[PDB]
Amino acid sequence: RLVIYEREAPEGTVKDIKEQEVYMGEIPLMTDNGTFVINGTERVIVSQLHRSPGVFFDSDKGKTHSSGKVLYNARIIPYRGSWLDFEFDPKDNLFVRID
Amino acid sequence: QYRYTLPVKAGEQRLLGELTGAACATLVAEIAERHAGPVVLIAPDMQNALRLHDEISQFTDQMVMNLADWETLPYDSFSPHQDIISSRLSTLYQLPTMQRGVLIVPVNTLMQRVCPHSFLHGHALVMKKGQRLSRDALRTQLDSAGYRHVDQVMEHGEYATRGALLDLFPMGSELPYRLDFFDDEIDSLRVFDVDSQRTLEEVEAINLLPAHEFPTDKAAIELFRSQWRDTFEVKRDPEHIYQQVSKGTLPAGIEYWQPLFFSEPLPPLFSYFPANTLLVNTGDLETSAERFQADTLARFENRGVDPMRPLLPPQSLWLRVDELFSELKNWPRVQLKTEHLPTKAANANLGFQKLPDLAVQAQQKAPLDALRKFLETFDGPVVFSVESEGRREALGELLARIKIAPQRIMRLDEASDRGRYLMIGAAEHGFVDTVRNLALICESDLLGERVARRRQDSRRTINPDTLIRNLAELHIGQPVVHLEHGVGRYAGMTTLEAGGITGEYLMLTYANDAKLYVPVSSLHLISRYAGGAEENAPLHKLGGDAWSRARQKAAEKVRDVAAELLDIYAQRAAKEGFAFKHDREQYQLFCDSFPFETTPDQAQAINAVLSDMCQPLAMDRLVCGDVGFGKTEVAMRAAFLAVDNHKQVAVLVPTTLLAQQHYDNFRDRFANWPVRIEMISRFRSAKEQTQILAEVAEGKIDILIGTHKLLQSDVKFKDLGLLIVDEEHRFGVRHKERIKAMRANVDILTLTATPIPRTLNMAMSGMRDLSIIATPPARRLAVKTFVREYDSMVVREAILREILRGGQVYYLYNDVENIQKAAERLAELVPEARIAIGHGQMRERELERVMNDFHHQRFNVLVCTTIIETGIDIPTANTIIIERADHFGLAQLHQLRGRVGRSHHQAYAWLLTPHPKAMTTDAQKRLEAIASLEDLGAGFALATHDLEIRGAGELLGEEQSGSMETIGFSLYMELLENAVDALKAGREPSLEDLTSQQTEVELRMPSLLPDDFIPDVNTRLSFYKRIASAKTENELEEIKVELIDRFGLLPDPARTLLDIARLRQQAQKLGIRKLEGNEKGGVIEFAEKNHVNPAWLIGLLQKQPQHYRLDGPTRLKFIQDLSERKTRIEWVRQFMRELEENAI
DNA sequence: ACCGCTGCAAGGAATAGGATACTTGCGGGCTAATGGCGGCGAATACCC
């Protein structure tokens, strides 16, 4: 449904509005069992398990800089967008990196 | 007596008013002519300044200058182009003492501060012979500069002063100069030796201008570094400005780090004003200074970031506004403004009433009614103020229509009580000075309406009873007309949301059940049906978008090219070209007419032209080079050599405009020799065409210029000896060789800017000559060029950088359907630009209006298609913005880069790109090529980039660009020479005249011999020879059966060919000379001595007027639905069979 | 009274508009990576 604002009137008014059944895309249909028939072959999408978006605190357990020093770090992981990381210098700093 | 006294006081203001357009210029001309002292006009903006810069010289005679402003933006990243700086300081050198003269500076400059005068009066020297100055004065000025008295000067920092003669050895040059002061005046400028003390050169004015406005040496560098370490902080970076200048080299915007290069406070240029100077004002300062300062600050904290190149606060690089208005109380000041102040002292309003409505139009029967009714009732003198000389004649016959006589005067004071005069100048607007009843009328005071026309809106006048008078009791299912779209079936009222506004609407169903919901408010667009067919009403489809109608399926190859190209090439290589004759002194007297000196490469290009012209061979020379490098005078010297041998030079260009400049160039250069030079285009009338082209056969016109009109199969040169063709990369192949088809051994010279790949490759493969040119005579600019992504603020700052320079912008979009929308899209992006629209599809009068108003600076930015590619003047345009450089041919990319420039001003060129991975790979190769080469002389290698990315086209066909898997060049040469000796084997008539003697038998039907039937082009060629030379049906059939014998069956193109030849036999047998046919019918044109039965032809006409009409005496238009070409052939066959049965 | 001059009818003439067919270019549609370790140069910044 398309809205057209008439130019003569102030900001937000209706000249006219149209509507029609546009067609877009041919989405596959799952069968009654689980199968998506793609090209005469019979594919199945498997459920993916991935690391949940959110915020996690982690530490490489002293494998870096050899002092016995554990380096805590924080991740903010979006479902869609840019990542965000904080971490620790062995000299007891906080360091932010992006992407 | 004058009209008004002047401000002569420390800080008095003089208010002057009642001022309309262009009156202020002659007012300040009066000011300069009445004040013994300087006049500095402060301008509100560059544009008006530059406009006033040619205004004031129109009205008076004093020397008038701008101050060259830095061209850049505040805190920009660009050098101010040292040459401009060299102009800037130079004026600034003489600014402390300049007695008479007018200087126009803008508030952009006047708010800027300048050098502290220590550097200028120390580290620079301009000195002219007419400077009355003494000996010890210049001696102590050299002492104050710090120089040493050595009486045998050899070292920088030395000068001599013995008796009257003074010598100087500067910081700038390696040479000392002898001065020889006499009578408190300078009387020699003698460039004498470092040791031998004798003069090299006698000079009048010595120009030792510093290479910069700022000190540049070492002590300046550590002073600057001291200042930077005091102010900013230095970071370890090999691009940071501190380290960059510490290496001695310079970045672009370095001058905007001004004050660190002195360690003094900087003067506001008021220090450079003379003793009693008179400042005159225009518009106001009290507005423009504010928003300039606001822009200045806003830009400063816009770039008050970025430790890479930090900036000084603007308080050092500029005055503040209050600081200005304080220093503007230090000078006697004049304020001119465009209204009526009432009454006070130091104030006057002078009668400068704006002109009445004087305008022309073709709509009225007598166009000059306002002028013809104004002039007899204007009691005073009348002045006409034409800009151009030739445009003067555009007024000359124009007022001759109202029978009114212009006299050419020079001075505005030359007015009598009542007399009509023309003034050559640079005004833009007129007025009446009612003090003396004087009237000045500009040319632009005639054409006030730049207006379009409206259309449509038919049913809004249909207020009939079918409108239903907004009954609002309409039933569902009523077929209802809605005047923009058509008829639908009304299906009720419905509420819908619309973006925070709920509403009630009338749902209406069109075809393909597309709903349309008009508001209940605007119910008056909605009308009841009128046809009375409520249950038989149609339905419109909404939108009417029938683009789908661009699908597929067009055929080609209606006419072969390859055989004919091979034919003309063989004919050229068979005969011998003309050995021209050269006269030393006669050519030298023509060289004398050239008021310039040839660059050496240009000379040897000219020499290679003549030393190929005078040979038994045929000339075929590419004279490729960049635009503006002096190509035309090469053709001048070529044509003169050609024309004195009486050889009828023919000139070809691919547009009317280039022909128009060429007519001026040819006529003005050939101003002393008995040669008649003319042009032809569509702009010439037919009655002029019918004598020019006829006279070409007679031939007293020796030089003829034109568009494709020459190649219209009617132009008959009596002795063609020279073809010159300009702006090559057009013209296909057929138009290129269609002229050479007339004369096999004609000499061809082809000028170009960037040659097309085909003619580049054929030239580089030894078939045609090549002569490249470089090294332009004037030091032109390589207008910096960029290829960046599309960015709303990047284009904005580009537009701003151009407009606060003062010139104009070519902004090209190249899509006419949306250029109207793109206009406001740019316009609220830059609200202070002035935008007009121009493209090739307007009504062919508003376009010229737009371009002439552009030519008179009435607006700044022009949105356009590639109409500007035709190469117009107006060098004030200095910035190209190609919005979508994705889809544009690289040769005309170079051509559009040639459009800006044409000036000592540094032009700019931004090539907007889309996102790099979105575009075509070929577009990326094009843009990398154009980003690689930004110089002069780079046009040709850019054409080598045009080739080898597209493939140079087929050597024996059309399609100049393309890979195409062509004929190999070695095989090409073999086929060529085989055609050559087979041609000269027994003097075989050229195929082209077999075209001419053949009756016109065109039928819009594919008639040729296809390549699969005969691969060998010589064999197909000689078969063409044998069929068109065959004069009996017996021999036609023998050739046909021989073809069948040689290659199997006979395909349809061959069959159609052979029966058209059969038709040609009886066409030439009867006298049926011109036969055109098509789908719709066609024209049979007979001879004057024809074999037509006249009474029987009238019988045809009176039995079928629908299929026989004599439109002319022998022109028979027959109208037949010739859907099948076989039926077309048999129709014409049986028709001439009827005519030979009635032949007499 | 009768050419002399003017105002209008016409007729042709010229010119805009809107068709057609020809060239250059070139694209658009369309068929035909943020779950890893190690070496090494770069790039340091770092103390001398």
Ligand SMILES: Nc1ncnc2c1ncn2[C@@H]1O[C@H](COP(=O)(O)OP(=O)(O)O)[C@@H](O)[C@H]1O
């Ligand atoms: N040898 C020369 N010395 C000085 N000026 C020249 C010389 N040759 C050309 N010019 C200048 O350059 C311009 C020549 O351009 P022209 O050959 O007419 O066409 P294009 O602009 O395509 O080169 C002229 O305006 C002329 O003033």
